[PDB]
Amino acid sequence: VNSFSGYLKLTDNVYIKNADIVEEAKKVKPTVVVNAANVYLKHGGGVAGALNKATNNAMQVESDDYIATNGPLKVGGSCVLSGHNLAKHCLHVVGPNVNKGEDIQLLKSAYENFNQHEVLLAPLLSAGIFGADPIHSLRVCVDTVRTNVYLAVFDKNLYDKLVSSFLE
Numbered sequence: 001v002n003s004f005s006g007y008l009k010l011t012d013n014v015y016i017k018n019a020d021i022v023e024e025a026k027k028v029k030p031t032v033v034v035n036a037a038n039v040y041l042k043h044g045g046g047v048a049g050a051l052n053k054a055t056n057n058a059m060q061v062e063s064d065d066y067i068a069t070n071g072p073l074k075v076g077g078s079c080v081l082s083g084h085n086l087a088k089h090c091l092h093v094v095g096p097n098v099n100k101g102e103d104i105q106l107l108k109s110a111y112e113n114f115n116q117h118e119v120l121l122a123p124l125l126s127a128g129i130f131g132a133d134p135i136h137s138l139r140v141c142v143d144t145v146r147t148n149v150y151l152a153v154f155d156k157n158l159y160d161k162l163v164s165s166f167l168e
């Protein structure tokens with residue numbers, strides 16, 4: 001149904017809301033939720049752990065089956081697997097983990113995976129355990145994504161800093 005409500009429109013195609021991505025998925029019933037994935041689709045932490053828990057581990061079981069046959073993703077890459085109870089599809093997208101020395105330049109490749117989907121519910125890529133500057137990630141999102149992206153930021157203080165930064 002893609003019933004996004006209460007978003008702030010930043011650009012013609014980028015929207016943001018102070019919200020929990022799991023509660024947004026349940027409310028909105030998106031066609032596609034983006035996972036903040038790692039290359040082995042091991043969803044023990046970060047947004048990936050929250051999504052997986054909300055699928056009662058179905059996302060991890062599917063991901064383990066996928067990886068054993070298909071091999072890992074690349075940093076900046078993606079795959080499309082089931083959205084389970086959260087969405088029709090899950091676009092697993094690997095942003096660079098700058099806490100572990102990966103190239104922040106790959107955040108552009110990471111966001112280019114969104115352009116194959118008309119509308120997405122998504123987290124800010126490379127935030128949290130991936131260690132990237134969120135203000136930078138929002139800029140790369142706005143510069144790179146052409147399709148409609150609805151970003152969910154749960155931390156209110158970070159949300160407020162992102163909106164204040166974007167309106168400068």
Ligand SMILES: Cc1ccc2[nH]c(C(=O)O)cc2c1
Binds near residue numbers: 002030031085086088
């Ligand atoms: C949760 C869920 C499941 C199946 C779904 N299909 C669609 C669609 O856009 O056709 C959205 C959606 C959301």
